[PDB]
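User: Predict the complex with chloride ion.
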Amino acid sequence: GVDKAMVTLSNGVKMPQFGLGVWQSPAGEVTENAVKWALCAGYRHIDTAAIYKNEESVGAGLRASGVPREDVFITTKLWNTEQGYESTLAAFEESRQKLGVDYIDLYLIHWPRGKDILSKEGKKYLDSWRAFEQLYKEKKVRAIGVSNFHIHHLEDVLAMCTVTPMVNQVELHPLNNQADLRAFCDAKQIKVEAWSPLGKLLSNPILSAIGAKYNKTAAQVILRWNIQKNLITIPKSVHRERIEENADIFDFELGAEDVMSIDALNTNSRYGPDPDEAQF
Ligand SMILES: [Cl-]
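Assistant: Here is the predicted structure with chloride ion placed in the model:
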């Protein structure tokens, strides 16, 4: 079930495979309610970021839910402008105080930053990674990873790390299924987590026809496909009925032909920025 499906990270930490994204959920009551409703529906994983400016609301929603903090996995992320060693330690402290927690479960570098910034300012994600390693040694964070890293960015970290990144959270859905990145990450025990897992994609005729066989929606089909590919998935919604619907994917299974038809939809088409080309 949604509270029970887990992926074991390389350091043995159990990370719930399914969580609530609060990307683009407004700070205040909207985020508090989304978090509270998700926890009440059995979610045990919330994904936020400093740049979402809603970490206070995530903490407030968790407190409102009455679910013990030790039963919930909280991920947050270092924003691009704060990369660097001392600045990363500071950013982490600010995120921690806003969430109202003593420890964070997973901390991610949000982006590597685009190639023109790397060329002018250097690969500051490497020194941020050293600061992550220090936070992990100090027991301030249970797991560390990255977001929006391509294979080449990971190779840069793997050449210098004392602790391998445990998660890489990237744009991943049936139109951009990240097969090559997933093969590399599998080789290096880096778990792949899908952002924007639902991407007009939810009107796709193949997807809704598959859903019709199991009395599921296209969105539920996409999320079940995430689960069967052993991916971590964090669909975002602020609406209670959608938050509950998205998690109701553990009572059905996609067969081989279904999964093949979904894999066939790939076009390597991104809705979000390409991490190499980003001008931020
Ligand atoms: Cl089949």
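The chain has one domain: 1-280.
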